[PDB]
Point group: C5
Chain length 103, copies 5
């Protein structure tokens, strides 16, 4: 029922919006144990992760985590411009909660 | 079974057909807990969502919900023109029930 | 095993081969309860469905139904020429059993 | 720990390598009961199948069978050149064990 | 969590970074029993695998192994440039732990 990524992001603690307005510069993916994750970076210097699935995640988030990784990969590969990221700022690198792209 | 989206839409209460005839303007995807959803917009101003899986959904709809988000993402990335949406209007933003594409 | 769509199709009751030699004109996808289905049409005027999974299906068909819907979406999006369809003609619209594509 | 498809193929009985060096001419996909399979052909006149999953397959092969079908479809759609196929020659059509693509 | 592939790679024994700076020359995929795996090579003559799943992998890695193979396929097909590979060098061909791509 949120209508924008900013509305959605504001419903949670320890988050903020990063306005990226840019394609992904680098995409990294790991299948190493305990580090099953994706890392993206932008020309601005910003690094963000999709976190390893863990105890902080609720059950409904598990498929959503896998979806987000799918999305970032095809976004990287198509040079698609990301508009905004909603991130958790209590993790290093900051962790992706949501993404938006505009055309 | 129904032969068009409008026939299918009319089988349900709280629905209407939006004629879009346009590609998606923005795509938003969230893996935040209890907001595992997708939101799209069009240059018309209209906003639509695929709802978070919930009690209103029957089991057969779970896979369908995942497919619909899959569909909206690739439709956005390929700039594919949507023809119509069948939406439930008892939700804000309106909730996607079905989609048709042509051209 | 059969080597051709025509061979495969002949193994079944209530089927026939439609020769299409065309891309899909329209693609319709529904996540509406009891109508979790895809419908395609052609410039020829013909309309086909992938049926909702039900009691007429054996277990091994469940994953194959989902694949066929995936195939129809990507075939639509890339505007790929379908060669033939094997369909059950005891349904409305006729129900897709198999698909072939050639260049 | 094979380094090539030819080495991998040589580890099994009733296999052989077909050198294709060509895109797929036709792709056929079936969700008919007991024939949940894919068939591909080439201009050469050669025909190959991904078999219906069955008791000849071990558990680890189930996901791999689904992957191979995904690969054949995307390979067909993008007109990607197949280098070699490793196939079991104790089935008709010959059954795909492995694929390589070179470009 | 790590911010680059090199940082991630250095958390593990028997690894090293390969600088590839090149698209994949060949992609090989097997659904043969006990060789359910992917092998890629490059112009350079280098060869890498994603390993058959086994006891060396923890549960967490299962889904990530399937993703990595997904990533290698789409990367081959789009002719996408790989920057680095983190690889376990106690296997032949060396086994991919992580990938990075730039631009
Ligand atoms: O040894 C590893 N971790 C161990 C952690 N270990 C603790 C001691 O100091 C070194 C790190 C824990 N396991 C428990 C079971 O017995 C082995 C030790 C380990 C080895 C790993 O390499 C082995 O598995 C790989 C696939 O995951 C590759 O196949 C690699 O070739 C193989 O050596 C990988 C990973 N990992 O990804 O997390 C962990
Ligand atoms: O504690 C969380 N939620 C609530 C805790 N409680 C837990 C049980 O269910 C009811 C809610 C706290 N409330 C939520 C409403 O606003 C007031 C505070 C919470 C923390 C969250 O952040 C933590 O998990 C994240 C991944 O989901 C990140 O890893 C983040 O860094 C971590 O802090 C996230 C989510 N979520 O997405 O739903 C919820
Ligand atoms: O109430 C629904 N169905 C039928 C019976 N249903 C049975 C379950 O208990 C509620 C009532 C009623 N229809 C009336 C028209 O003639 C046919 C029978 C129903 C409501 C529905 O709307 C509700 O769920 C939607 C998602 O599935 C949306 O979230 C919508 O906003 C919500 O109202 C949807 C669906 N459906 O998808 O099949 C069915
Ligand atoms: O009756 C069937 N098989 C034999 C009886 N068991 O010389 C049968 C009927 C079939 O048709 C019925 O189910 C179909 C879906 O698989 C369609 O729904 C079709 O309309 C319906 O008649 C299909 C299949 N099948 O695919 O294996 C088998
Ligand atoms: O025996 C043994 C064996 C036989 C095998 O051949 C049989 O199964 C194949 C599919 O796994 C083919 O169906 C082949 O035709 C059949 O002989 C294959 C495999 N294997 O993949 O590990 C092992």
């Amino acid at each position: 029922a949120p209508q924008t990524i900013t509305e959605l992001c504001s419903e949670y603690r320890n988050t903020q919006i990063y306005t990226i307005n840019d394609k992904i510069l680098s995409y990294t993916e790991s299948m190493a144990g305990k580090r099953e994750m994706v890392i993206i970076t932008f020309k601005s210097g910003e690094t963000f992760q999709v976190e390893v699935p863990g105890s902080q995640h609720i059950d409904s988030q598990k498929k959503a985590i896998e979806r987000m990784k799918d999305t970032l990969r095809i976004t990287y590969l198509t040079e698609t411009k990301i508009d905004k990221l909603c991130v958790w700022n209590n993790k290093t690198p900051n962790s992706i909660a949501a993404i938006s792209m505009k055309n």
